[PDB]
From a paper:
Despite the ‘rule of thumb’ that blood feeders from independent evolutionary lineages utilize different protein families for various salivary functions, the saliva of sand flies contains apparent homologs of the two-domain long-form D7 proteins of mosquitoes. In this study we demonstrate, using binding studies and bioassays, that the sand fly long-form D7s do in fact bind both cysteinyl leukotrienes and thromboxanes, and thereby serve as anti-inflammatory and anti-hemostatic agents in both sandflies and mosquitoes. In this study we show that the long-form D7 proteins from sand flies are functionally like their counterparts in mosquito saliva and share a conserved structure. Consistent with these structural observations, the sand fly proteins were found to perform the same anti-inflammatory and anti-platelet functions as their mosquito counterparts through the binding of cysteinyl leukotrienes and TXA2 in the N-terminal domain, but do not bind biogenic amines, as this function is performed by the yellow proteins.
An initial model containing two protein monomers was built using the experimental electron density map and then positioned into a wild-type data set by molecular replacement. The N-terminal domain contains a hydrophobic channel leading from the surface to the interior of the protein that is much like the eicosanoid binding pocket in Aedes and Anopheles long-form D7 proteins. The C-terminal domain appears generally like those of the mosquito proteins but does not contain the biogenic amine binding pocket seen in AeD7, the Ae. aegypti long D7 protein that binds both eicosanoids and biogenic amines. The N-terminal domain of ABI15936 contains two disulfide bonds that are conserved in the mosquito proteins. These link Cys 17 with Cys 47 and Cys 45 with Cys 93. The C-terminal domain contains three disulfides linking Cys 143 with Cys 159, Cys 155 with Cys 202 and Cys 192 with Cys 211. Although ABI15936 was crystallized in the absence of any potential natural ligands, electron density was observed indicative of a non-protein molecule occupying the N-terminal domain binding site.
Residue numbers in the entry: 0 to 196, 198 to 230
The structure:
């Protein structure tokens, strides 16, 4: 189950993963400077980030406004105006989620960057002060191979790696919406790994890891190679 607020590693992972899933987009460079143009790839990039931050409720097709407000409160940022526009059900499309949130973004850019660690100084400070989280510039394998982290406190083999690959969350529950298609893992294959993982504790992590690797032996290697900055 997802934890709130989101930390600077968790927000960074959401931005970077969604950028990789749209890496051929015309507007990629604009996203890097916190500009979100009105085009289809940007619409779906925005939906992806809301989802990967844990702030899109797939059951009711609505933003988790309670958790968005919690992010601001926990970061000591004033709640912005225009929350009504971002609230309520969408029709599920990227276009609708973009249209509901673009003015909220445009009208609060720097407060949003503060709340979601989108400023280099604030992110750097979080990472320096949270040394038990994988640092920027360090591979998942190298970080998780240290301090016996892969044991997960117990007898596991991939407890840390499965978390940083976002196969499981902090509760060792599978992340159901993870998209590994470009790595050669279809939605059906990933779903089968989720289903295979009544397991308990870090054994969920190990089962996810071993199942993904069985489907494609390079998929997790590619994530590890991408992992210094995701
Ligand atoms: C090389 O590293 C570049 C990393 O860039 C990370 C920053 O990402 C660019 C900004 O993209 C977004 C994506 C979504 C959003 C939304 C609209 C979802 C708002 C948010 C993040 C405050 C919830 C805002 C900016």
């Amino acid at each position: 189950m997802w934890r709130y607020p989101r930390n600077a590693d968790q927000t960074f992972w959401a931005f970077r993963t969604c950028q990789r899933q749209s890496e051929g987009a015309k507007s990629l460079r604009e996203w890097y400077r916190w500009n979100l143009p009105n085009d289809e790839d940007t619409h779906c990039y925005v939906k992806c980030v809301w989802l990967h931050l844990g702030l899109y409720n797939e059951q009711n097709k609505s933003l988790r406004v309670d958790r968005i407000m919690e992010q601001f409160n926990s970061r000591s940022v004033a709640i912005p105006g225009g929350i009504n526009t971002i609230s309520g059900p969408t029709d599920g499309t990227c276009k609708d989620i973009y249209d509901k949130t673009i003015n909220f973004f445009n009208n609060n850019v720097n407060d949003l960057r503060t709340a979601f660690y989108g400023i280099k100084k604030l992110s750097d400070e979080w990472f320096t002060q949270n040394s038990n989280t994988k640092p920027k510039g360090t591979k998942i394998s190298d970080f998780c191979n240290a301090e016996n982290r892969e044991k997960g406190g117990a007898d596991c083999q991939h407890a840390c790696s499965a978390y940083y690959y976002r196969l499981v969350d902090e509760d060792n529950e599978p992340i159901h919406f993870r998209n590994l298609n470009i790595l050669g893992i279809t939605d059906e294959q990933f779903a089968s790994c989720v289903k295979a993982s009544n397991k308990q504790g870090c054994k969920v992590a190990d089962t996810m890891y071993n199942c993904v690797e069985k489907h494609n032996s390079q998929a997790l290697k590619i994530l590890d190679n991408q992992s210094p900055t995701y």
